[PDB]
Amino acid sequence: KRGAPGGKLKMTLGLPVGAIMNCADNSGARNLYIIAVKGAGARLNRLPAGGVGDMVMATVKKGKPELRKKVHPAVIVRQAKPWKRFDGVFLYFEDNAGVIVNPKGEMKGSAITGPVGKEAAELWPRIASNAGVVM
Amino acid sequence: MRTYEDTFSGQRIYPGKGKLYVRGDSKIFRFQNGKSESLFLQRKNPRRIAWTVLYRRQHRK
Amino acid sequence: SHRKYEAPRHGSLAFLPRKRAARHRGRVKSFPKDDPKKPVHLTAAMGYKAGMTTIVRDLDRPGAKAHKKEVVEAVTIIDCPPMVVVGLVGYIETPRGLRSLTTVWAEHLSDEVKRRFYKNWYKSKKKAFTKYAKKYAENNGASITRELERIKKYCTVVRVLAHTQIRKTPLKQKKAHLMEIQINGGSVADKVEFGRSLFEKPVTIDTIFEKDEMIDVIAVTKGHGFVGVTARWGTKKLPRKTHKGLRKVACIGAWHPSHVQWTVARAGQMGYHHRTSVNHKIYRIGKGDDEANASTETDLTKKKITPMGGFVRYGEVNNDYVMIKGSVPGVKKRIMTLRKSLFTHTSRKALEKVELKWIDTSSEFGHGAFQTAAEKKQFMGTLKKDL
RNA sequence: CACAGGGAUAACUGGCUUGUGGCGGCCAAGCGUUCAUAGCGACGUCGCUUUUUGAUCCUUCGAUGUCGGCUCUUCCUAUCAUACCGAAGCAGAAUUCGGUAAGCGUUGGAUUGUUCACCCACUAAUAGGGAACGUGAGCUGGGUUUAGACCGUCGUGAGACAGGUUAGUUUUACCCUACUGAUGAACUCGUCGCAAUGGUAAUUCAGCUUAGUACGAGAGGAACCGCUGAUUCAGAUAAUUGGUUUUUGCGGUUGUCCGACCGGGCAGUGCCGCGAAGCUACCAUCUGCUGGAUAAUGGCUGAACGCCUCUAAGUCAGAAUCCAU
RNA sequence: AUUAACGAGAUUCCCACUGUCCCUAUCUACUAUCUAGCGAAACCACAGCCAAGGGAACGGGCUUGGCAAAAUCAGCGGGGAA
RNA sequence: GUGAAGCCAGAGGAAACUCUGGUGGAGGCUCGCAGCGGUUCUGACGUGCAAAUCGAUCGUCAAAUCUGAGCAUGGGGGCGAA
Ligand SMILES: [K+]
Ligand SMILES: [K+]
Ligand SMILES: [K+]
Ligand SMILES: [K+]
Ligand SMILES: [K+]
Ligand SMILES: [K+]
Ligand SMILES: [K+]
Ligand SMILES: [K+]
Ligand SMILES: [K+]
Ligand SMILES: [K+]
Ligand SMILES: [K+]
Ligand SMILES: [K+]
Ligand SMILES: [K+]
Ligand SMILES: [K+]
Ligand SMILES: [K+]
Ligand SMILES: [K+]
Ligand SMILES: [K+]
Ligand SMILES: [K+]
Ligand SMILES: [K+]
Ligand SMILES: [K+]
Ligand SMILES: [K+]
Ligand SMILES: [K+]
Ligand SMILES: [K+]
Ligand SMILES: [K+]
Ligand SMILES: [K+]
Ligand SMILES: [K+]
Ligand SMILES: [K+]
Ligand SMILES: [K+]
Ligand SMILES: [K+]
Ligand SMILES: [K+]
Ligand SMILES: [K+]
Ligand SMILES: [K+]
Ligand SMILES: [K+]
Ligand SMILES: [K+]
Ligand SMILES: [Mg+2]
Ligand SMILES: [Mg+2]
Ligand SMILES: [Mg+2]
Ligand SMILES: [Mg+2]
Ligand SMILES: [Mg+2]
Ligand SMILES: [Mg+2]
Ligand SMILES: [Mg+2]
Ligand SMILES: [Mg+2]
Ligand SMILES: [Mg+2]
Ligand SMILES: [Mg+2]
Ligand SMILES: [Mg+2]
Ligand SMILES: [Mg+2]
Ligand SMILES: [Mg+2]
Ligand SMILES: [Mg+2]
Ligand SMILES: [Mg+2]
Ligand SMILES: [Mg+2]
Ligand SMILES: [Mg+2]
Ligand SMILES: [Mg+2]
Ligand SMILES: [Mg+2]
Ligand SMILES: [Mg+2]
Ligand SMILES: [Mg+2]
Ligand SMILES: [Mg+2]
Ligand SMILES: [Mg+2]
Ligand SMILES: [Mg+2]
Ligand SMILES: [Mg+2]
Ligand SMILES: [Mg+2]
Ligand SMILES: [Mg+2]
Ligand SMILES: [Mg+2]
Ligand SMILES: [Mg+2]
Ligand SMILES: [Mg+2]
Ligand SMILES: [Mg+2]
Ligand SMILES: [Mg+2]
Ligand SMILES: [Mg+2]
Ligand SMILES: [Mg+2]
Ligand SMILES: [Mg+2]
Ligand SMILES: [Mg+2]
Ligand SMILES: [Mg+2]
Ligand SMILES: [Mg+2]
Secondary structure, three states, X not given: OOOOOOOOOOOOOOEEOOOEEEEOXXXXXXXXXXXXXXXXXXXXXXOOEEOOOOEEEEEEOOEOOOOOOOOEEEEEEEOOXXXXXXXXXXXXXXXXXXXXXXXXXXXXXXXXXXXXXXXXXXXXXXXXXXXXXXX | OXXXXXXXXXXXXXXXXXXXXXXXXXXXXXXXXXXHHHHHHOOOOXXXXXXXXXXXXXXXX | OOOOOOOOOOOOOOOOOOOOOOOOOOOOOOOOOOOXXXXXXXXXXXXXXXXXXXXXXXXXXXXXXXXXXXXXXXXXXXXXXXXXXXXXXXXXXXOOEEEEEEEEEOOOOOHXXXXXXXXOOOOOOOOOXXXXXXXXXXXXXXXXXXXXXXXXXXXXXXXXXXXXXXXXXXXXXXXXXXXEEEEEOOOHHHXXXXXXXXXXXXXXXXXXXXXXXXXXXXXXXXXXXXXXXXXXXXXXOOOOOOOOOOOOOOOOOOOOOOOOOOOOOOOEEEEOOEEXXXXXXXXXXXXXXOOOXXXXXXXXXXXXXXXXXXXXXXXXXXXXXXXXXXXOOOOOOOEEEEEEOOOOOOOOOOOOOOOEEXXXXXXXXXXXXXXXXXXXXXXXXXXXXXX
């Protein structure tokens, strides 16, 4: 089945196609480069975009030569664009970052550096186990 | 339902106002308006800004 | 040849004549259908728009993600002093539609209503209903009771005439607003008995509506002037190097239909249209004589609904008010019309009972930080002004 | 490079034709494990269309601006997806053939001036076409197609090439109609109403449960009701967050001028930080109804035709369709 | 055939940068707009609402239908094969 | 701004000679103001202020640089870094 989380609520999306974010696990990659979003619809001239907690297709531009020149799934864990939840509080992080996964949802690495947003932890249980400070 | 206190100036925060900031080292900051946030990001010291709680309690006013 | 790629059209053709509305006061084009097995009651009211604020409550919706958690929502406040009933009208069915055949007024009318029938009241002789009033003192008002009997015999739809008491608001206007309100209930004889017993008496909004009810709001929207296509319809801007303007539509039709058609977007007037927005839930009906009409069970502060410093470009809400979830068309100070619902609700989102926990009353003239004047003084201490 | 002319005559639209291109039928040797027709159709043969290209030269040479893209509206059905159905060499799952149906959609990119094409990726799907091969007093000017210049082949030469390359001015609306909005004479001046006619609006997906159930030796593997969200579209609104700053509102600071302090002028808003009000953003929040008559198809009673038959008289249900609210 | 330095000469990639774009919003001055004064030109057979038909094979006027109510202001770029 | 020949002082080596610090002020050298010119916006205007102008951005700037007056060459002739 196509990989996009079920039951996600509406939130501001801060990362369109063509953005480079940081890598936040120990797989050997340094940065990720977004080429698609796993739930986008159709509309003339509209770039697909994603937020914290949804799957993305990306390539690595700096890292081990065994991971370059390839297309991997990934999940966004923190973004620099302010957004709010149903409790009415606007929050934002200091950078944009994501981790590498497989289509089933298991993380390729084993450790996560830095804090993660609550949406990513709630939707992907595998990322929750390796997380430290949440939100 | 509870209130919070501004990290830079000590002003009271009611639900829905201000913003929350999470820095790269997992430290949490809360602000009530845009004046506090701008001065914090400019790296001013709250003990040298005359209208803050920290300044007032230090000078015993 | 065909257009290269597909895309939906900009705008809707259902609200098509983008002209200024004919009348400033909103117009009720339909009423809920009558049931003769229910007690007699009114179906509409009117008020004035004050502003918006914020509330906090905990949600009740099994299966949802925010179930049994607190949420933040925006609301709208309507200032609603009572109305005065002045008369009633009757209607009959014809092969050409409904038409009115009689209307009978009350003996005494206030200067608020009489101003509605004039355009220079300050220099008139003010004789609007002087000769009609004498009909009550002749033959024990047999002419008045004759018209009432006619309505009982021929009419099948009965409506009432009512006007606002605009002197109880902070507005500069002295001329009241008048409308017709249909009576739904048991029998035509019952409708006349109920309607006439309300002659020149005040009616409060809490007898018409109630809490946890879905209603509709009718008004005229905010007005802008002459507006181009980009903002009026939402068309894509043209490139940066376009000669002779770039806020246009490039092609306004093919060759052979040989006329500019009615489905193309063009510059004209925007705003000040008549609208009817539906399914707005009522959260609170507050009384004007209560000194704590903005207090909840978990918040025991004694305060009223007016923010610190007052609503911007409006006064203070010293009368009864209705709190509505969301937004409604119209600017502040504008007359609102409230109508009962034409729909049936079984959605479990419209059947929810709401209990409030906190209501914001800080200043909206800036980044307000305190709920009351006492709280601000306790926080700051003593100032040079206090001596 | 020039003059007198020509629509007696070519290069673009339009008109007749339809060889060629595209699409649809008839017969039944044969394929299909047996079995012409579940799905196909050899030898033959009848058509339709004007989004291919030819054939002709009727209109225009005292001029109808000649490629492609961008923007925007509407129409056709020979249906890619969505609704409800018939058939199978249809156990389930996935597929294939057919009917009513144009209401609603049909995308983000690398190279190429490209029409055409070929790849990467999302999606329910990434269907085919017309409107003077729609659209230059709407844009653009990359190509082609004036004058400058280089190369290859050709020519004794001036020069040629549907061969490659580089640089090359895109004019006018104030008139009539059409369209979008805005006033208004005549029957006293006003307030409250009715409704002929015109317009019309929503759309698709996912998660949980049903359920590891029905079916199947196994491997595998559904659906109706119910609950919660999201994509595209439409109409509003400014409590909160963000943007905007001539509030020239307060503060800081450079040069020069008013003898210094105070308080000010000039540098078309000197420059910088914060900044209310107003406007505003799927960069923010709210909201989007149910009646009737039907098509395909499946049925009831029932003759013609002593049996049979959904039909001939009569009648039931019924689609994202149609007409109304 | 190579070639350091030089070039408002043609071409490909990288870092920084940005409203070129997602997707559009807001502000200032001068216009346009209204008034007093002053005051032209291009163009013009006659004119100026459509659908179909036939016709020099794309009608404003002809034939059969649809329809059709004074005098007017700001814009607009379909047609007048302007 | 850069810093060529010539000149002064010190140091190394058996010699032939070599190294360091100053002085000096060359070049159809270089950044850039006035003049001279005219790359791009394919900007303004395009019945213009103007029958070639206006704005911002650009090229050169001590020599094959810019410029006044007097004089010469006259139409199948002149003049031409073409
Ligand atoms: K897509
Ligand atoms: K086209
Ligand atoms: K508030
Ligand atoms: K001719
Ligand atoms: K001719
Ligand atoms: K043919
Ligand atoms: K054709
Ligand atoms: K042809
Ligand atoms: K021809
Ligand atoms: K011609
Ligand atoms: K293109
Ligand atoms: K043409
Ligand atoms: K073109
Ligand atoms: K070229
Ligand atoms: K050039
Ligand atoms: K015109
Ligand atoms: K209709
Ligand atoms: K309707
Ligand atoms: K809007
Ligand atoms: K506001
Ligand atoms: K603001
Ligand atoms: K400023
Ligand atoms: K100043
Ligand atoms: K929005
Ligand atoms: K049937
Ligand atoms: K039926
Ligand atoms: K050059
Ligand atoms: K004008
Ligand atoms: K004038
Ligand atoms: K014709
Ligand atoms: K005739
Ligand atoms: K020198
Ligand atoms: K210069
Ligand atoms: K001569
Ligand atoms: Mg595009
Ligand atoms: Mg299409
Ligand atoms: Mg241009
Ligand atoms: Mg405010
Ligand atoms: Mg000629
Ligand atoms: Mg001819
Ligand atoms: Mg053929
Ligand atoms: Mg056989
Ligand atoms: Mg054949
Ligand atoms: Mg001609
Ligand atoms: Mg033309
Ligand atoms: Mg012409
Ligand atoms: Mg068909
Ligand atoms: Mg089909
Ligand atoms: Mg592109
Ligand atoms: Mg054609
Ligand atoms: Mg064309
Ligand atoms: Mg045109
Ligand atoms: Mg060119
Ligand atoms: Mg040439
Ligand atoms: Mg030549
Ligand atoms: Mg030769
Ligand atoms: Mg042109
Ligand atoms: Mg109608
Ligand atoms: Mg079993
Ligand atoms: Mg703000
Ligand atoms: Mg000064
Ligand atoms: Mg039978
Ligand atoms: Mg016609
Ligand atoms: Mg014809
Ligand atoms: Mg004509
Ligand atoms: Mg006629
Ligand atoms: Mg124009
Ligand atoms: Mg035209
Ligand atoms: Mg030089
Ligand atoms: Mg130089
Ligand atoms: Mg130009
Ligand atoms: Mg002009």
